[PDB]
Design an enzyme around this catalytic site. Structure first.
Site, PDB file in Angstrom:
ATOM      1  N   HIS A 122      -5.735  28.280  -6.493  1.00 25.04           N
ATOM      2  CA  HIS A 122      -6.394  27.278  -5.680  1.00 25.04           C
ATOM      3  C   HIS A 122      -7.068  27.911  -4.493  1.00 25.04           C
ATOM      4  O   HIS A 122      -6.413  28.299  -3.529  1.00 25.04           O
ATOM      5  CB  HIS A 122      -5.403  26.214  -5.233  1.00 25.04           C
ATOM      6  CG  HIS A 122      -6.052  25.060  -4.520  1.00 25.04           C
ATOM      7  ND1 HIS A 122      -6.464  23.956  -5.164  1.00 25.04           N
ATOM      8  CD2 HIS A 122      -6.384  24.886  -3.184  1.00 25.04           C
ATOM      9  CE1 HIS A 122      -7.012  23.105  -4.284  1.00 25.04           C
ATOM     10  NE2 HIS A 122      -6.969  23.676  -3.072  1.00 25.04           N
ATOM     11  N   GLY A 123      -8.388  28.038  -4.559  1.00 23.88           N
ATOM     12  CA  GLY A 123      -9.167  28.585  -3.448  1.00 23.88           C
ATOM     13  C   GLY A 123      -9.551  27.506  -2.455  1.00 23.88           C
ATOM     14  O   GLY A 123      -9.671  26.335  -2.816  1.00 23.88           O
ATOM     15  N   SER A 124      -9.725  27.904  -1.199  1.00 21.12           N
ATOM     16  CA  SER A 124     -10.107  26.990  -0.128  1.00 21.12           C
ATOM     17  C   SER A 124     -10.670  27.801   1.034  1.00 21.12           C
ATOM     18  O   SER A 124     -10.527  29.022   1.066  1.00 21.12           O
ATOM     19  CB  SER A 124      -8.901  26.158   0.330  1.00 21.12           C
ATOM     20  OG  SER A 124      -9.292  24.866   0.778  1.00 21.12           O
ATOM     21  N   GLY A 181      -3.888  23.615   7.814  1.00 19.79           N
ATOM     22  CA  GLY A 181      -3.589  22.288   7.280  1.00 19.79           C
ATOM     23  C   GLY A 181      -2.864  22.332   5.946  1.00 19.79           C
ATOM     24  O   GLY A 181      -1.954  21.531   5.689  1.00 19.79           O
ATOM     25  N   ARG A 195      -3.174  18.180  -0.469  1.00 13.27           N
ATOM     26  CA  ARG A 195      -3.185  16.727  -0.517  1.00 13.27           C
ATOM     27  C   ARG A 195      -4.321  16.247  -1.417  1.00 13.27           C
ATOM     28  O   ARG A 195      -5.271  16.985  -1.688  1.00 13.27           O
ATOM     29  CB  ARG A 195      -3.311  16.139   0.891  1.00 13.27           C
ATOM     30  CG  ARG A 195      -2.087  16.320   1.784  1.00 13.27           C
ATOM     31  CD  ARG A 195      -2.494  16.849   3.156  1.00 13.27           C
ATOM     32  NE  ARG A 195      -3.101  18.184   3.059  1.00 13.27           N
ATOM     33  CZ  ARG A 195      -3.922  18.733   3.958  1.00 13.27           C
ATOM     34  NH1 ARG A 195      -4.269  18.080   5.066  1.00 13.27           N
ATOM     35  NH2 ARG A 195      -4.407  19.950   3.743  1.00 13.27           N
ATOM     36  N   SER A 250     -11.876  29.873  -8.533  1.00 17.16           N
ATOM     37  CA  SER A 250     -11.218  29.415  -7.314  1.00 17.16           C
ATOM     38  C   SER A 250     -11.742  30.163  -6.102  1.00 17.16           C
ATOM     39  O   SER A 250     -11.847  29.586  -5.019  1.00 17.16           O
ATOM     40  CB  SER A 250      -9.707  29.601  -7.408  1.00 17.16           C
ATOM     41  OG  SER A 250      -9.067  28.422  -7.856  1.00 17.16           O
ATOM     42  N   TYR A 274     -14.575  28.808  -3.896  1.00 21.73           N
ATOM     43  CA  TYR A 274     -14.286  27.792  -2.872  1.00 21.73           C
ATOM     44  C   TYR A 274     -13.795  28.405  -1.559  1.00 21.73           C
ATOM     45  O   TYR A 274     -13.470  27.689  -0.610  1.00 21.73           O
ATOM     46  CB  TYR A 274     -13.296  26.740  -3.383  1.00 21.73           C
ATOM     47  CG  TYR A 274     -13.788  25.969  -4.592  1.00 21.73           C
ATOM     48  CD1 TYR A 274     -14.701  24.918  -4.461  1.00 21.73           C
ATOM     49  CD2 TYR A 274     -13.342  26.293  -5.870  1.00 21.73           C
ATOM     50  CE1 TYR A 274     -15.155  24.218  -5.572  1.00 21.73           C
ATOM     51  CE2 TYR A 274     -13.788  25.600  -6.983  1.00 21.73           C
ATOM     52  CZ  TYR A 274     -14.688  24.560  -6.832  1.00 21.73           C
ATOM     53  OH  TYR A 274     -15.118  23.883  -7.953  1.00 21.73           O
ATOM     54  N   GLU A 298     -10.021  24.199 -15.913  1.00 14.98           N
ATOM     55  CA  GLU A 298      -9.457  23.718 -14.653  1.00 14.98           C
ATOM     56  C   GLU A 298      -8.359  22.692 -14.893  1.00 14.98           C
ATOM     57  O   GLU A 298      -8.359  21.995 -15.908  1.00 14.98           O
ATOM     58  CB  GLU A 298     -10.531  23.194 -13.697  1.00 14.98           C
ATOM     59  CG  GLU A 298     -11.372  22.022 -14.181  1.00 14.98           C
ATOM     60  CD  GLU A 298     -12.534  21.755 -13.240  1.00 14.98           C
ATOM     61  OE1 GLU A 298     -13.415  22.647 -13.133  1.00 14.98           O
ATOM     62  OE2 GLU A 298     -12.558  20.668 -12.603  1.00 14.98           O
TER      63      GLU A 298
HETATM   64  N1  LIG Z   1      -9.570  24.583  -5.285  1.00 17.10           N
HETATM   65  C1  LIG Z   1      -9.878  25.262  -6.382  1.00 17.10           C
HETATM   66  O1  LIG Z   1      -9.605  26.455  -6.491  1.00 17.10           O
HETATM   67  C2  LIG Z   1     -10.517  24.583  -7.444  1.00 17.10           C
HETATM   68  C3  LIG Z   1     -10.359  25.175  -8.695  1.00 17.10           C
HETATM   69  C4  LIG Z   1     -10.945  24.609  -9.814  1.00 17.10           C
HETATM   70  F1  LIG Z   1     -10.798  25.141 -10.944  1.00 17.10           F
HETATM   71  C5  LIG Z   1     -11.691  23.452  -9.669  1.00 17.10           C
HETATM   72  C6  LIG Z   1     -11.840  22.907  -8.462  1.00 17.10           C
HETATM   73  C7  LIG Z   1     -11.272  23.449  -7.351  1.00 17.10           C
HETATM   74  C8  LIG Z   1     -11.601  22.650  -6.322  1.00 17.10           C
HETATM   75  O2  LIG Z   1     -11.216  22.796  -5.163  1.00 17.10           O
HETATM   76  N2  LIG Z   1     -12.327  21.605  -6.695  1.00 17.10           N
HETATM   77  C9  LIG Z   1     -12.824  20.519  -5.806  1.00 17.10           C
HETATM   78  C10 LIG Z   1     -14.222  20.867  -5.238  1.00 17.10           C
HETATM   79  C11 LIG Z   1     -14.825  19.675  -4.512  1.00 17.10           C
HETATM   80  N3  LIG Z   1     -14.885  18.545  -5.452  1.00 17.10           N
HETATM   81  C12 LIG Z   1     -15.714  17.399  -5.048  1.00 17.10           C
HETATM   82  C13 LIG Z   1     -17.129  17.799  -4.592  1.00 17.10           C
HETATM   83  C14 LIG Z   1     -17.986  16.526  -4.462  1.00 17.10           C
HETATM   84  C15 LIG Z   1     -17.304  15.515  -3.517  1.00 17.10           C
HETATM   85  F2  LIG Z   1     -17.933  14.378  -3.608  1.00 17.10           F
HETATM   86  F3  LIG Z   1     -17.324  16.045  -2.230  1.00 17.10           F
HETATM   87  C16 LIG Z   1     -15.855  15.213  -3.935  1.00 17.10           C
HETATM   88  C17 LIG Z   1     -15.055  16.504  -3.992  1.00 17.10           C
HETATM   89  C18 LIG Z   1     -13.523  18.105  -5.788  1.00 17.10           C
HETATM   90  C19 LIG Z   1     -12.799  19.184  -6.563  1.00 17.10           C
HETATM   91  C20 LIG Z   1     -12.552  21.761  -8.134  1.00 17.10           C
END
Ligand SMILES: NC(=O)c1cc(F)cc2c1C(=O)N(C1CCN(C3CCC(F)(F)CC3)CC1)C2
Length: 340
Positions: A192-194, A201, A208, A234, A237, A318
């Protein structure tokens, strides 16, 4: 001075850096004069989500130019900028992403202002999160580094990835919260990247799910917690560039149970009976053969091979869970993105 290991200290310094909180607000063109870090609130960001939902309601119901104009004015009054009219989904989703970030940025800042030994140690405690260093030569590090090397995607070739630090993490309360969900198996260690500015947070409150106030579309698989089995998917992100080669990432233990496996976007109002997570199917998957176990947890660390899955939205897999209690955060990595 501080009793924590240098790597833990450098992590705290990075997570609570007030400069970079400010910097991302400038990046989002927030008028820091009209709204500095100190003036952000949960209630403010909450109502801004609601305005964004109203924009989307209007757009779908095809409202008049002035009704859309009114709403944009309300939004930019609630969140002052130094601008794009919100009339399509793409501009609305750009603003959701911003608010998600600001929500975390507020949480980080509220932590520093609260409370009454090095500031570093006092900060570390506000996280209510045990952080221990995983040794470079350990078994955990060998597996983790392999997970990184092997699950790097070929289309993500703009950078090389290097693991600088690996941390064992244990969030207060999380284990007691997670225990019942071990009953469903298919537990797997996932990415999970951020953004770095989110991690204060993330550790205080865990991962969350989007608030009910937020608009529903943009989400491929609804409002849940989203994971990857390919490190680089990931890593994207982390939103790291030239000025920031250092990013942060989580390995989490996700209790997937019976996976509702899909190829196309769906709005998961309700999981089908006996289904406990969703897995989006990519064109590229880690080798099913090369799966490894680490402490009873499955680690899909095989080199990404071509899965025979055709006619699918996604290039890479995913995973999505819908109860926050289905996640147990285990490792935090510090990564250098070595660009080209
Ligand atoms: N966090 C992750 O590493 C990650 C890994 C994945 F394989 C897929 C996703 C993520 C991740 O954070 N994802 C989020 C990225 C942002 N989206 C949306 C983007 C459009 C929005 F309208 F803002 C709603 C949120 C929701 C899912 C997909």
């Amino acid at each position: 001075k501080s009793k924590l290991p240098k790597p833990v200290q450098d992590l705290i310094k990075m997570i609570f850096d007030v400069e970079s909180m400010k910097k991302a607000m400038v990046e989002y063109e927030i008028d820091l004069q009209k709204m500095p870090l100190g003036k952000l609130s949960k209630r403010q960001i909450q109502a801004a989500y609601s305005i964004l939902s109203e924009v989307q309601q209007a757009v779908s119901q095809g409202s008049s130019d002035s009704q859309i104009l009114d709403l944009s004015n309300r939004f930019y009054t609630l969140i002052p900028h130094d601008p794009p009219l919100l009339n399509n989904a793409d501009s609305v989703q750009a603003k959701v992403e911003m608010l998600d970030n600001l929500l975390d940025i507020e949480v980080a800042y509220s932590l520093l202002r609260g409370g009454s030994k090095d500031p570093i140690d006092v900060n570390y405690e506000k996280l209510k999160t045990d952080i221990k260093v995983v040794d470079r030569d350990s078994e955990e590090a060998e597996i983790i580094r392999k997970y990184v090397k092997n699950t790097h995607a070929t289309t993500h070739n703009a950078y090389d990835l290097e693991v600088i630090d690996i941390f064992k993490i244990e969030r207060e309360g999380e284990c007691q919260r997670y225990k019942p969900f071990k009953q469903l198996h298919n537990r797997r260690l996932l990415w999970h990247g951020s953004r770095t500015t989110n991690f204060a947070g993330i550790l205080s409150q865990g991962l969350r799910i989007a608030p009910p106030e937020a608009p529903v579309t943009g989400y491929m698989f609804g409002k849940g917690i989203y994971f990857a089995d390919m490190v680089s998917k990931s890593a994207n992100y982390c939103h790291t560039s030239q000025g920031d080669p250092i990013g942060l990432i989580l390995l989490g233990e996700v209790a997937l149970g019976n996976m509702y496996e899909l190829k196309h976007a769906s709005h998961i109002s309700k999981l089908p009976k006996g289904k406990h997570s969703v897995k989006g199917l990519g064109k590229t998957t880690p080798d099913p053969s090369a799966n490894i176990s680490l402490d009873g947890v499955d680690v899909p660390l095989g080199t990404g091979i071509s899965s025979g899955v055709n006619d699918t939205s996604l290039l890479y897999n995913e995973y999505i869970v819908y109860d926050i209690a289905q996640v147990n955060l285990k490792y935090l990595l510090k990564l250098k993105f070595n660009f080209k």
